[PDB]
Amino acid sequence: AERVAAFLKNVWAKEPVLVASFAIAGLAVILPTLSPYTKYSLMINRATPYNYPVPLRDDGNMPDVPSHPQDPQGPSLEWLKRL
């Protein structure tokens, strides 16, 4: 509208410090939801191994669990190197 651009133009003239603060805080709240890279933050936190990776007893029907750390099976960090 135009009743609002005159409001914003008034605070920008009388209280520039607060207009900046309310602009930065809105960006902080909003941008994380709209960013396509927020998913990589969860993955990178999930990819960091703090504990020992305890192996699974190989009963005989665990096809996708690798037998060796260098085997093709299991999750990979290929996206992390390119990212």
Binding site: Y52, V54, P55, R57, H68, P69, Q70
Partner: protein, 114 residues
């Protein structure tokens, strides 16, 4: 209550891996790919059994695979490895990223001789 069972000193003996922590750090990546099988059996034992006594044999094979690993290096790649872990040992944090050249020389050495 019963008597806490303890294996005697004779059973606890084994040849140690008497190399410093920076030597282990420098070989750690190759070490984890060469000695994975005995290493993972020991750790499966420990988590399953929850008892250091019930996994004393498996822990001796960890040393045996580790000692053999360090002889493979001492027979073919001693100098590139000595030059590499001496760079790691200098840093207070033992950082990998400070010794990428010496790490490289060590990698072609093992990828050709082993």
């Amino acid at each position: 209550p019963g008597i806490v069972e303890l294996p005697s000193l004779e059973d606890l003996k084994v040849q140690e891996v008497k190399v410093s922590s920076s030597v282990l750090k420098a070989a750690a990546h190759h070490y984890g790919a060469q000695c994975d099988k005995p290493n993972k059996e020991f750790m499966l034992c420990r988590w399953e059994e929850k008892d250091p006594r019930r996994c004393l044999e498996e822990g001796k094979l960890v040393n045996q695979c580790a000692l053999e690993f360090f002889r493979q290096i001492k027979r073919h790649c001693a100098e590139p490895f000595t030059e590499y872990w001496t760079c790691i040992d200098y840093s207070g944090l033992q950082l990998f990223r400070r010794c990428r050249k010496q790490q490289a020389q060590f990698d072609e050495c093992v990828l050709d001789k082993l």
